[PDB]
């Protein structure tokens, strides 16, 4: 027999997980392979959470672990204690609603999988959308943390394949309430795009600074990320921002079903192999990983199952996801209205309308050229 434990948020989610695992057991042949699941709730103290999760799940000799973000607002502490504790061995952990760039460095987290697009796909879809409007004068603002640095690196390498340069890049530092030099420097240029990847609160101050510089209106389009038009950042914001978001974001039951289906497929694929051991139990008396640890992860990367709730749930080399779906939304006098769909190099605009941040209707071309030069010469005898 085998067991697949998990860490969920509420008891209703636990009941949904039980129903899903029962349905999965009802599927397939279920010959000599039974998977009864166990669940556990969250805790405020991270130390208590880590100790409890190891002593509970490790002692049960699990074969996989599922972790989901707790219902508490903001923050990202959801996977870190479980990932660190279960990272001692090579038991894979599946993410459910944790989209952060810190969990992409395989050197730090050597065993972590999820099915949610990270924040790099925002840069990828920005490039894909820009390729169809033909402006190619991107100037972007990046927060000086690990979150914005990944986006900067992702945007830098993608444009090199097309042999293009993206104006200038600025750095405004996190946890500050006064930025004026960056906006003033960006005022004089030939690039009418304000591509921005902020982090919640900083969006408010940058929007106030931009509004005080009278740059929103009759040109100067804006592009932002999913987290830059949510909550308090939405209150102080100008219209016309292409506030791209993600489809089926705050949905987990479908993701739970997809995860359990792919886990069952991977387990069935792995069962037909050579001798297989079991992960140790006790959290105390064992200091060695089992032999075929990374083998399960490797066979889990190459597991494709495009029949659960959505399209092809394909894991790439990084392990985040492949072939995701977005929904380009545009602010228009509040009450965001869907404007287009994205499915991968096939951006399909809808036919509702477009309102650029000036009240106009034509697409604003991003170039002025200033019709002014600053010639510099060196004194010479017969020339100057």
């Amino acid at each position, epitope marked *: 027999i085998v067991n697949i434990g998990a860490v969920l948020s509420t008891r209703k989610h636990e009941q949904m997980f039980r129903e899903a695992v029962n349905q999965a057991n009802k599927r397939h042949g279920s010959w000599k392979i039974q998977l009864n699941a166990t669940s556990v709730t969250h805790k405020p103290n991270a130390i208590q959470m880590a100790l409890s999760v190891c002593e509970d799940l490790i002692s049960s000799q699990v074969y996989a672990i599922l972790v989901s973000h707790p219902p508490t607002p903001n923050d990202h502490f959801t996977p870190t204690p479980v990932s660190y504790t279960a990272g001692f061995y090579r038991i894979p952990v599946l993410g459910l609603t944790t989209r952060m760039s810190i969990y992409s460095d395989k050197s730090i987290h050597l065993s972590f999988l999820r099915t949610v697009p990270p924040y790099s796909h925002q840069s990828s879809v920005w490039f894909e959308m820009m390729r169809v409007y033909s402006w190619n004068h991107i100037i972007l603002l990046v927060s000086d943390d690990h979150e914005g640095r990944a986006a900067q690196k992702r945007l830098e390498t993608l444009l090199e394949e097309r042999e293009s340069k993206a104006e200038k890049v600025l750095q405004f530092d996190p946890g500050t309430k006064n930025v004026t030099a960056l906006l003033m420097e960006a005022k004089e240029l030939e690039a009418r795009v304000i591509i921005l990847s902020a982090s919640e609160d900083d969006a408010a101050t940058v929007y106030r600074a931009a509004a005080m510089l009278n740059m929103t209106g009759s040109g100067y389009v804006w592009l932002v990320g999913e987290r830059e038009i949510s909550g308090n950042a939405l*209150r102080y914001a*100008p219209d016309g921002i292409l506030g791209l978001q993600l489809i089926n974001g705050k949905n987990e039951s479908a993701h739970i079903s997809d995860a359990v289906g792919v886990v069952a497929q991977a387990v069935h694929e792995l069962l037909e192999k050579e001798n297989i051991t079991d992960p140790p139990r006790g959290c105390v008396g064992n200091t060695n990983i089992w032999k075929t640890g990374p083998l399960f992860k490797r066979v889990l990367m190459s597991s494709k199952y495009a029949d659960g709730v959505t399209g092809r749930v394909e894991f790439n080399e990084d392990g985040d996801r492949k072939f995701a779906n977005y929904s380009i939304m545009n602010l228009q*006098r*509040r*009450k965001l209205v869907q404007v287009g769909i994205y499915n991968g190099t096939h951006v399909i605009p809808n036919d509702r*309308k477009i309102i650029w941040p000036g009240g106009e209707t034509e697409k604003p071309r991003g170039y002025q050229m200033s019709t002014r030069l600053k010639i510099v010469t060196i004194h010479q005898e017969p020339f100057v």
Partner: antibody
Amino acid sequence: LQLQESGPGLVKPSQTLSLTCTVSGGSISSSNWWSWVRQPPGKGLEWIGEIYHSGNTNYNPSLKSRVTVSVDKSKNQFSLKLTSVTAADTAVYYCARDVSGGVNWFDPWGQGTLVTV
Amino acid sequence: NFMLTQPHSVSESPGKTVTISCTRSSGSIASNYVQWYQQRPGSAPTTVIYEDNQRPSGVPDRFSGSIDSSSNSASLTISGLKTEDEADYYCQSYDSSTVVFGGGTKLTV
């Protein structure tokens, strides 16, 4: 700017109301917005939709398939077509457009119209 | 979508301070702005408070607005009550989907 709303005068049950709110001193084509306000007798107030001369409009999610509002820049008029209106739809319709600004705030308010289905 | 709760009616002595509260049950009324309209009996409504910190041109300075930010309610204060102020007061707010109006209250001298 001033607003004057005139209705068809027909308040028969199971019909469609279509009024027009003319604007004096203002231009229909602009960067602003125009919206309709409904007030039932002896109750609160609710918003039924907003118009824009440049295209898309957002009426409401409650009656998304029963209300259609159109504009005509030639006559400086905007009118609504509320189909399949029940006999209990007796209320007063007012036309206050918007303020550009950064948030929605109705200023000024039209004199409104009286309808008793 | 949500609803706004307002008391049916209030009464106070003239020349005193009267505080009216509009409460938003769902979410939290702390980010999006609110506005305070006044409608005379049989007349078109007139805006009285916008942005909860500024007043329209020619509006009396007695009216003031404040945000509790703790009980999730907006307060409007009127000083120096007069018989000409007898009208209905409505709280209007906007959300990421639609807009809503308060129940409304009427004061009596």
